[PDB]
Amino acid sequence: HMIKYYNINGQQVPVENATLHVSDLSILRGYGIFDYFLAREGHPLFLDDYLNRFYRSAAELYLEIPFDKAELRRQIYALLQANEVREAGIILVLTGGYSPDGYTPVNPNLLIMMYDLPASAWEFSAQGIKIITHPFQRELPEVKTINYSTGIRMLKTIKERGATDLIYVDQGEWIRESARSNFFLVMPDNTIVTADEKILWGITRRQVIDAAREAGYAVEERRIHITELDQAREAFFTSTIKGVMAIGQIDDRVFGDGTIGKVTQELQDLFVGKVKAYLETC
Amino acid sequence: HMIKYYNINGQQVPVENATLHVSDLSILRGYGIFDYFLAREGHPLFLDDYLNRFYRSAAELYLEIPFDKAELRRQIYALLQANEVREAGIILVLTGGYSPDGYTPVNPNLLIMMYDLPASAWEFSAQGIKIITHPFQRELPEVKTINYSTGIRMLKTIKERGATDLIYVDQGEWIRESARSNFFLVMPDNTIVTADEKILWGITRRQVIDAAREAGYAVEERRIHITELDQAREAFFTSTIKGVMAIGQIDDRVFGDGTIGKVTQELQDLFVGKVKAYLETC
Numbered sequence: 161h162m163i164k165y166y167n168i169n170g171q172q173v174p175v176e177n178a179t180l181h182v183s184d185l186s187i188l189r190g191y192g193i194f195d196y197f198l199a200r201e202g203h204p205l206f207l208d209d210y211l212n213r214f215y216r217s218a219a220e221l222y223l224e225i226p227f228d229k230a231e232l233r234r235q236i237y238a239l240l241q242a243n244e245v246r247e248a249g250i251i252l253v254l255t256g257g258y259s260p261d262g263y264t265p266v267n268p269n270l271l272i273m274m275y276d277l278p279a280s281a282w283e284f285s286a287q288g289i290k291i292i293t294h295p296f297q298r299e300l301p302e303v304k305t306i307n308y309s310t311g312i313r314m315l316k317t318i319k320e321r322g323a324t325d326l327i328y329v330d331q332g333e334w335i336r337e338s339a340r341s342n343f344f345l346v347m348p349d350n351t352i353v354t355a356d357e358k359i360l361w362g363i364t365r366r367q368v369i370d371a372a373r374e375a376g377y378a379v380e381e382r383r384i385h386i387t388e389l390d391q392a393r394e395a396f397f398t399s400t401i402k403g404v405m406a407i408g409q410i411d412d413r414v415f416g417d418g419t420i421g422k423v424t425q426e427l428q429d430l431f432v433g434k435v436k437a438y439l440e441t442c
Numbered sequence: 443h444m445i446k447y448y449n450i451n452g453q454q455v456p457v458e459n460a461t462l463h464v465s466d467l468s469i470l471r472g473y474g475i476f477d478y479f480l481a482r483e484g485h486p487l488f489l490d491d492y493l494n495r496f497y498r499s500a501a502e503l504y505l506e507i508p509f510d511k512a513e514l515r516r517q518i519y520a521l522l523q524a525n526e527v528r529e530a531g532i533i534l535v536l537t538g539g540y541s542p543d544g545y546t547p548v549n550p551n552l553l554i555m556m557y558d559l560p561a562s563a564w565e566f567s568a569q570g571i572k573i574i575t576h577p578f579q580r581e582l583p584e585v586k587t588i589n590y591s592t593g594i595r596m597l598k599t600i601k602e603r604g605a606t607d608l609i610y611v612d613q614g615e616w617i618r619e620s621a622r623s624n625f626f627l628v629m630p631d632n633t634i635v636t637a638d639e640k641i642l643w644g645i646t647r648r649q650v651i652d653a654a655r656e657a658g659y660a661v662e663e664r665r666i667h668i669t670e671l672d673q674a675r676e677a678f679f680t681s682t683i684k685g686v687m688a689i690g691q692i693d694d695r696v697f698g699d700g701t702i703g704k705v706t707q708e709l710q711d712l713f714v715g716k717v718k719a720y721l722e723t724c
């Protein structure tokens with residue numbers, strides 16, 4: 161394949177003509193929401209859950225999506241067909257729109273953009289990644305806003321310090337999530353622990369919590385103190401692109417020998433199970 | 443007049459052709475900085491101070507402005523001349539640019555946009571405005587990021603509650619600033635008080651602090667507890683558009699009779715003094 165079209169406000173447009181006027185509130189004021197999901201075998205994965213979150217995020221910024229969910233789903237499928245692709249990354253963006261005063265939102269601009277399935281998608285490396293803690297709390301964390309400035313600004317420091325990612329700790333006390341991932345601990349008794357509050361409710365997080373409970377693991381959704389890293393055997397990320405990704409080091413702590421923990425490897429397999437089961441309903 | 447041109451990346455472009463490709467990081471990730479200043483008698487006001495802040499904000503997001511300050515100043519003057527206007531609002535935007543991966547910043551896109559001088563600019567109403575307190579702390583507050591989502595999202599609640607603005611209170615404890623203004627108290631002994639930390643260092647704030655000290659007022663730059671509203675005689679905003687704007691009510695508290703306090707009215711006159719003195723050096 162090669163990506164020929166995006167969709168702006170219900171119209172398929174060649175990628176090279178896909179533009180917004182500079183008065184768009186995303187450009188001037190960072191006012192917008194988005195979602196991102198993969199397609200496999202021609203089907204966006206868990207699509208109803210992603211679209212439900214997109215409509216919920218939009219409601220929290222008082223931005224009306226111009227199409228109902230069934231019509232949005234049609235445009236997404238139509239865009240897969242127009243690009244002639246079965247495997248893809250799909251972005252949805254809803255901006256504050258072409259504001260008259262550079263502040264008051266009006267009709268949003270809706271973007272559907274499409275890319276190759278990321279090469280790294282569900283790599284499931286046996287080698288855990290290395291991350292740093294960073295004291296920070298995302299704004300409006302339950303809403304998928306376009307606001308990624310702390311995450312992006314931290315790229316230089318992350319790379320400088322020999323890490324590939326970070327875990328946000330609210331006031332250096334409470335473990336939350338990374339800029340683009342949910343965060344989980346596995347304790348020595350095999351209890352899975354993940355933040356309940358002041359985080360984005362990831363679609364991957366949902367599927368992994370459900371799979372873990374179906375397998376008979378105890379999954380605690382609660383606040384996690386920074387000191388509880390020392391009680392954990394395993395640490396992992398969930399996200400649309402990562403699936404389940406082993407974390408082998410946080411700051412000066414190696415999780416086991418740095419390689420993927422047993423419950424993490426099991427959750428990887430069960431995640432792939434959830435994906436296969438989804439694609440069987442399509 | 444009528445505005446004919448903006449400037450994108452050093453090129454004058456008709457306003458109707460001023461667009462960014464949808465891959466721009468401001469659109470996808472809210473990654474960018476900006477500045478906004480007025481021009482009078484053909485001269486952007488306090489321009490060196492605004493441009494210094496623009497370069498400082500850019501450095502904090504690791505975004506390189508493609509032009510040095512003298513060249514940027516030339517483009518701004520050239521754009522005033524091309525639009526044939528002496529009175530204007532001028533926006534500068536520096537985005538994270540056309541990122542290959544929808545996350546890593548590259549060469550920024552630089553926008554210079556121009557509008558009529560706001561009709562409300564320095565209205566200096568004798569009637570104080572009505573504002574609400576809102577518990578919130580801006581991200582990277584010393585940097586003028588494009589991230590205005592809390593401020594914009596609050597518009598509905600502000601208007602619903604019969605207010606026209608808000609004052610952010612960090613953890614409902616520490617008075618900071620509004621979404622677009624610095625915040626000052628005047629005490630009964632005529633001491634002026636304003637936040638020192640975790641706020642944007644406004645150009646208007648600077649000029650008003652300097653003018654107050656020149657007049658022999660005590661100006662304390664310190665943390666302000668929410669309970670100190672009850673010790674204050676006067677409250678006002680500073681911003682590029684407002685100049686000095688009387689606040690007549692915060693929540694259930696009327697400042698005096700709701701009309702502009704004596705020190706606030708004096709600071710308005712001294713602000714206009716600073717403006718006239720600036721325009722005499724041009």
Ligand SMILES: Cc1ncc(COP(=O)(O)O)c(/C=N/Nc2ccccc2)c1O
Nearest residue numbers: 196339340341342360362363364399400
């Ligand atoms: C703050 C935050 N927390 C968790 C997730 C994981 O959610 P899910 O399992 O539903 O993917 C994401 C995902 N971002 N995805 C993303 C962000 C930027 C660019 C590309 C993708 C996120 O932004």
Ligand SMILES: Cc1ncc(COP(=O)(O)O)c(/C=N/Nc2ccccc2)c1O
Nearest residue numbers: 478621622623624642644645646681682
């Ligand atoms: C957070 C914050 N705090 C203070 C000021 C006042 O700074 P100055 O006296 O230098 O104007 C501004 C100004 N925004 N200006 C602005 C924002 C959005 C749209 C238009 C103008 C601000 O954003």
